[PDB]
Amino acid sequence: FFDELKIDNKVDIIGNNVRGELPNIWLQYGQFKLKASGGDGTYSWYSENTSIATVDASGKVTLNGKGSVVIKATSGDKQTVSYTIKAPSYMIKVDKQAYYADAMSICKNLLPSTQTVLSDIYDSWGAANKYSHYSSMNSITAWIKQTSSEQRSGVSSTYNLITQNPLPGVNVNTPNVYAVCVE
Amino acid sequence: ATETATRDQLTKEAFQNPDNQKVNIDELGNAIPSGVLKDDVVANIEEQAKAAGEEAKQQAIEN
Amino acid sequence: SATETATRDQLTKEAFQNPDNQKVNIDELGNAIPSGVLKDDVVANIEEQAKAAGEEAKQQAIEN
């Protein structure tokens, strides 16, 4: 005698309590919550492809890789509904720390072209440490692909996936800068 | 030669301008002096030092 | 003395290469940006070295 199980279209981004739909640009390992209504109130969740996403019994999802996948919700009264995650425009991946040149290597030249590429990820998700995977980090300075001047000058810009704090004039050979790849 | 002295001076002045200098990053995403001068600045220093070497040298040899 | 001044330039230049002898301008975010000025200790210590190079030059010429 229960209602037709449903999964709310709007998700809850953990990192910034925004209640809206799954952002179109991803922070590998960012997380949000699906809200299941209808059914006998009892829920069980699971992703059809753990390589792309994962979901805990409470409905919290984690993005593991770029691609598309389905998250199923199941109630006690035998109802299964599918919430589909469509592959994002691009996705942020924090790799190893590496001098600029190495950043490019490791990333196949796919470092962020402009700073907005990383700042938008912030605006859509929040500090990366608000999430389970980056949870105990104090900083994630990231490389921003050089410009011509930057290049003749021997430096490049940077942005911080956690504290933002963009900084220009950065020595290409400084330690403590992560190779963040955009795929 | 004297291009050595020139190099030194032009570099000391270079360093006096916070902009000509590159910056590093500590384990907190914070800036810190690097001790290195930007590439184009270092080049333009050389150009002027060597050009000052020839200047003074080839000049003095004027008898 | 050309010796003193040249020396001073060299020692100053060298000391800047060690970002630890540099006064900095820490902002709000925690960013210690180089101010362009060396720590008083260095300036003072270099100053002496520069002078010793100078006297060492003068004394050297005199021993001739």
Q: Cα distance from C13 to chain A (closest Cα, Å)?
A: 19
Q: Residue A21 carries which DSSP code?
A: S
Report the alpha-carbon distance of residue A32 to residue A45 in Å, rounded: 14
CATH number at residue A74: 2.60.40.1080
Task: Please name which of A102, A152, A155, A160 lies closest in space to residue A126, comparing C-alpha atoms.
Answer: A160
Contacting residues of A for B30, CB less than 8 Å apart: 165
DSSP A37-62: EEETS-EEEEES-TTTEEE-TTSEEE
The answer to whether C24 faces chain B, any CB pair under 8 Å, is: yes
φ and ψ at residue C49, rounded to 5 degrees: -55, -50
Write the residue in A139, A154, A169 that is nearest to B29 by C-beta. A139
Any chain A CB within 8 A of the CB of C17? no
Q: How far apart are CA B59 and CA A13, in angstroms?
A: 73
How far apart (Å, rounded) are the C-alpha atoms in residues A2 and A53? 29
Spatial CB neighbours of A149, under 8 Å, sequence gap ≥ 6: none
- Residues of chain C positioned with their CB less than 8 A from the CB of A127: none
Evaluate whether B22 touches A157 at the Cβ level (below 8 Å).
Answer: no
Which of A35, A68, A90 finishes a domain?
A90
Cα torsion C13, B40, A160, A92: sign:
negative
| Nearest one of A118, A119, A105 to A179, comparing CA atoms | A105
Within 10 angstroms of residue A20's Cβ, the number of other Cβ atoms is 12
User: Among residues A90, A125, A146, which one ends one of the domains?
Assistant: A90
Distance CA A26, CA C44 (A): 54
Confirm if A69 and A55 have CB atoms less than 8 A apart.
no
In DSSP notation, A147-179 reads -HHHHHHTEEEEEETTTEEEEEEEETT-SS-EE
The Cα–Cα gap between B44 and B42 comes to 6
Pairing of strands A26-27, A11-13: unpaired
Residue A60 CA to residue A38 CA, distance in Å, equals: 18
- Number of C-alpha atoms within 13 angstroms, CB side, residue C62? 6
| Spatial distance between the Cα atoms of A70 and B36, rounded to a whole number of angstroms | 51
CATH architecture of the domain C1-64 equals Irregular (4.10)
Q: In CATH, what number is assigned to the domain containing residue A139? A: 3.10.100.10
Kindly report the CA angle at A173 between A170 and A174, in degrees rounded to 5? 65
N-to-C CA span, chain A:
47
Q: Which helix (H) or strand (E) holds C8?
A: helix C2-16
Resolution to one decimal, Å: 2.8
- List the subunits that have 3+ CB pairs under 8 angstroms with C: A, B
CATH class for domain B1-63? few secondary structures
Distance CA C39, CA C58 (A): 29
Q: Distance between CA A139 and CA A128 in Å, rounded?
A: 9
For residue A60, give both structure tokens.
Answer: 């919290």
| Of A34, A15, A21, the residue nearest A122 (C-alpha) | A15
Question: How many Å separate Cα B4 from the centre of its chain?
Answer: 11
Q: Where are the domains of chain C?
A: 1-64
Q: Residue with structure tokens 């220093």? A: B45
- Mark which residues 24-63 of B lie under 8 Å from A by CB: 24-31, 34, 36, 38-41
Which chain B residues touch C6 with a CB distance below 8 Å? 4-5, 8
Domain extent, residue A99, equals: 91-183
